[PDB]
Design a protein around this nucleic acid. Sequence first.
RNA 1: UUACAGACUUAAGCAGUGGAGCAUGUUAUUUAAUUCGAUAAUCCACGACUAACCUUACCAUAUUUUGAAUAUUAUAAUAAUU
RNA 2: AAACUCCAUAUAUAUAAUUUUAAUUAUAUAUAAUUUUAUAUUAUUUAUUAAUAUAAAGAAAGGAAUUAAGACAAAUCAUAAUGAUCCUUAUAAUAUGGGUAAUAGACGUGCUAUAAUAAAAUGAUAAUAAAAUUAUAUAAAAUAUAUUUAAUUAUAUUUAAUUAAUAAUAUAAAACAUUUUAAUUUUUAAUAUAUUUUUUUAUUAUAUAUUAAUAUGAAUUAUAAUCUGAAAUUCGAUUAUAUGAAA
Lengths: 98, 113, 79, 122
Amino acid sequence: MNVPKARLLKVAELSAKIFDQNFNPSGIRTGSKILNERLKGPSVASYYGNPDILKFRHLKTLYPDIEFVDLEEQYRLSMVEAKKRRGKGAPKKMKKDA
Amino acid sequence: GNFRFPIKTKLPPGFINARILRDNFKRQQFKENEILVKSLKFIARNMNLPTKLRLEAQLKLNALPNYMRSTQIKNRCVDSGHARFVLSDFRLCRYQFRENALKGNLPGVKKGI
Amino acid sequence: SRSVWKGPNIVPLPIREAMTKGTPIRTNARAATILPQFVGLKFQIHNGKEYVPIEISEDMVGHKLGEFAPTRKRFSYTQ
Amino acid sequence: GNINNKLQHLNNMNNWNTQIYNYNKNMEIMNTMNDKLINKLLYKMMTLKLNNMNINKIIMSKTINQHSLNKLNIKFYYYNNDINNNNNNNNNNYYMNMMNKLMNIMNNNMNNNLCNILSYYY
RNA sequence: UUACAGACUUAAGCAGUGGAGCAUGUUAUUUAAUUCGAUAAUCCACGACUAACCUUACCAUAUUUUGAAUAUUAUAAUAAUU
RNA sequence: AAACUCCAUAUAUAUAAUUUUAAUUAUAUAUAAUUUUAUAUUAUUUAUUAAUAUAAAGAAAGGAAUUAAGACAAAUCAUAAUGAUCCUUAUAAUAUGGGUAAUAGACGUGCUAUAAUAAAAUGAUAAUAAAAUUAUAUAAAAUAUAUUUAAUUAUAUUUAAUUAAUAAUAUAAAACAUUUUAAUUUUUAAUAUAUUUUUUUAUUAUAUAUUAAUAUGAAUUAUAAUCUGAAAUUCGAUUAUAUGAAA
Ligand SMILES: [K+]
Ligand SMILES: [K+]
Ligand SMILES: [K+]
Ligand SMILES: [Mg+2]
Ligand SMILES: [Mg+2]
Ligand SMILES: [Mg+2]
Ligand SMILES: [Mg+2]
Ligand SMILES: [Mg+2]
Ligand SMILES: [Mg+2]
Ligand SMILES: [Mg+2]
Ligand SMILES: [Mg+2]
Ligand SMILES: [Mg+2]
Ligand SMILES: [Mg+2]
Ligand SMILES: [Mg+2]
Ligand SMILES: [Mg+2]
């Protein structure tokens, strides 16, 4: 506390120089914090998982010899045909050209 | 042929719904533009630069699309898409957390004391 | 209350045309800060449904456009 | 005695379908998410068809994903009722039934084994 | 419908609720919209472990039309096979 | 089903070159109780018994989880999933702004307060915790401003250490001691006085109003500044000066 401020400022400046630190004696807002924050993009953008997963549609070309059946897809197609037979099918979609 | 978002994005590998697609798109574009937003924010908040350059950066920041905003990213359940009471340790909503926990799907989760 | 050191909340607006032609500026930027240049110009400010016509005076500088376009109707009970 | 012998108790690690510990919690969440997705995919690879009227459904249990420091082992139990050639002959020694073809792409296929595809995913 | 037993209750005790201001939920009413439940015990800081944008499910305006999926059939650009 | 059990607790062994130190600890294994024993008394279905007391031994005193059936066709189609039915240029999809925060009355649940067995300051060789958190971070010390010697509080500047039994969030708080405290003339002051002296006594002055709101209370509101964010107008948080409602 009795150490003159000039002496303590000389130590701060030299120390900052040796340790590659930003010396801002005035205290002006410099934005250095923004320049030092970490990039969270990679972590944020992987939230929902890796998109390059093997999918059932790729199995018919990876393994031509084997014939796989998608029961979930097959069930949906059967429900579509059933509704067509009862007359409860879907209306034909209007064309933008019209 | 007509993707709903301005830029082409790959689909998440698991459960999909409209809200998940919207959130995922914002996540990908935040990563592509994160550096740009930080650089403009620096120029706009650096008091050593002239006010004119600072105001130019602020104007550019206000003109960026909403899908580049970090504050618009919302954690959703990766299994159901529900966006309330989502545990970040598993990225699942409370109900899906309980169901997965009891099935032994969460690596080290057991029932409490 | 935006920190004064950050400056005004400047938004892209067509002020040059409104200063050389006198046309009203229709805008949805309710957050925009009324800058001292805007004084005298005519603005049409969205309130969620309609665009409220408002002319800017010298006592409006510093405030924001949204402050002059109320978004709700006055409450009334079926007494 | 019971818990101090490997033959008299079930290791608690087996109570979980994903057996993993990563210091990087994010990578652990990713591995857990990858294990559910692969489990779903494998369920879709169990139904096979030789002809329109010969659909063989293999019943698969949930996968046990053993994550060690160097490798991931995906262990699962499966049941298949061989209804196409359930004879007393040795004709099955001269062709690969659909279930053998499916099991041989997991590790044996030299060009497109599922392990190599998953090795890049993980 | 009988008897007994059990609690249920009551008592005692401590601090509160019910009164003031504010926070919050609900109702009612209003509103272009005031999203939707739950709504005696067993709803009412409940769903919701955080509504400025997002969230969002509502309203106004503008805009998109095989759309996020699978398959079929064409067309191309590309790499292998032959 | 009970239990067995797991947890807690007590003890033993093992592990730690006791500077990742908390060895007064950490966490693996095992042990222990559903306590036991005698003695007198009182009842009994009197016997190889209960209810009590008494002495003796012991650390021994607490919890957990899960379901068996059935009812409310109780809640949920808004965690996700299914049938039927309806929309398919729209009841699907995207953007900007707005709303979900409106306000007569009513209700539920909370917070703060209405003063003296109770509130406010101050307490640096730093009284005394536990359980958590920190790679989509936790942020030390220091310096600057508010702001005054300093401290305290808030923010800025800067970004030490630690991705952790190591460093940080973080010197726990109440407690306890001293001082102060409206209503209260139960006070304060001027003289004199004392073997109560941080005090006693005496004589003067110390208000009036007043069932009442103060140095209680902190709602409401003005102005300035700050924090997060691209953005704080509808509609966020904090600080300073001023305001000071009901109770
Ligand atoms: K809003
Ligand atoms: K008090
Ligand atoms: K505001
Ligand atoms: Mg958010
Ligand atoms: Mg919107
Ligand atoms: Mg909104
Ligand atoms: Mg020690
Ligand atoms: Mg609400
Ligand atoms: Mg007080
Ligand atoms: Mg201490
Ligand atoms: Mg400090
Ligand atoms: Mg202390
Ligand atoms: Mg104190
Ligand atoms: Mg006070
Ligand atoms: Mg009064």
